[model samples]
Target: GSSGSSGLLSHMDDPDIDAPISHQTSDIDQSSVDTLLSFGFAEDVARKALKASGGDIEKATDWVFNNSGPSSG
Candidate 1:
C-alpha cells in the first residue's frame, strides 16, 4: 500500500473511472511532436492535447491554448 493515498488512489488508478469516462492513447508523428517542442508547449499538457486531437499539429496547438486559459493553474 502507498502512503497518504486518496480514496480513489487507494482503490486504483484507472484511466476511466466509469463507463461514461475513458481516455485513449495512440502514437502520433515525430513532425508534430517536434512542433510542440519547437513552440515551447507545456511538457505533458501539450502532448496530451496533441493526442486528443488525433495527431494534428494545427488542431493540437489550438486545443492546448484553448483549454489552457487564465483560470488554469
Candidate 2:
C-alpha cells in the first residue's frame, strides 16, 4: 500500500480495520456516502457502490454510471 493510503477517506482508515467485533460495521465514512448521494444516487445504493470501490470516489462514480441504467428524468 502507498503512503497516501492512510487518510480519512482511504480504505486503510476504515473503522472495520480498527474496530472490535462488537463495533464492526459502525463508524462508516460519511464523506463517501455524501459524495455519492450528491450525484443523485440513493443512500443504500451509494453505500454499495462506495464499498465495492474500496471507498474511492472516482471509482464509485464510474461504477454507478456503468451499472445504473438510464436515470428517469
Candidate 3:
C-alpha cells in the first residue's frame, strides 16, 4: 500500500469551488453583427454569419460573402 499517494488523494477531495453558468454571450456579439451590417449585409444575414463564425467579424464577413445572396463583385 502506498501511503503518500493515498494521503495526497484524500487532501484534494474537499476544496472544490462552484462557478455560475453563463446565461448569455453564447449567441451573436451585437457589435460584430452591427459591423457586418455596416458592410452592406442584411440584418438577418449578419446575425447568422456572426453566430456561425463565433462572433469573429472577419470570418463572419467571409461567411457572408461566400454564403449570403447577391454577388460581392
Name the candidate, 1 or 2, with the larger lDDT value: 2
Better of 1 and 2 by TM-score: 2
Off by over 4 Å in 2: 1-23, 26-28, 69-73
Global CA lDDT computed for model 1: 0.64
Error of 1 at 8 (Å): 52
lDDT of 3: 0.70
In the predicted model 1, the residue pairs found to clash are: none
**Which 10-residue window of candidate 3 scores lowest in summed lDDT?**
1-10
- Candidate 3, residue 71: lDDT: 44
lDDT of 1 at 52: 82
Choose the strongest candidate by lDDT: 3
lDDT (tens digit, per residue) of candidate 3 on 1-73? 0112224455553434354555455578666677777787876778878878878888888888777766444
lDDT ranking, best first: 3, 2, 1
lDDT per residue for candidate 2 within 10-36, as digits (tens), equals 655555675466753534466677777
RMSD of each: 11.6, 8.0, 14.9
Q: Each candidate: what lDDT?
A: 0.64, 0.66, 0.70
The per-prediction tally of clashing pairs is 0, 0, 0
Give the alpha carbon lDDT tens digit for every residue of 1-73 in model 1.
Answer: 1123234455556645676634444566545666687676765655776878867878888888778644346
Clashing pairs in 2: none
Per-residue lDDT value at 59 in model 3: 87
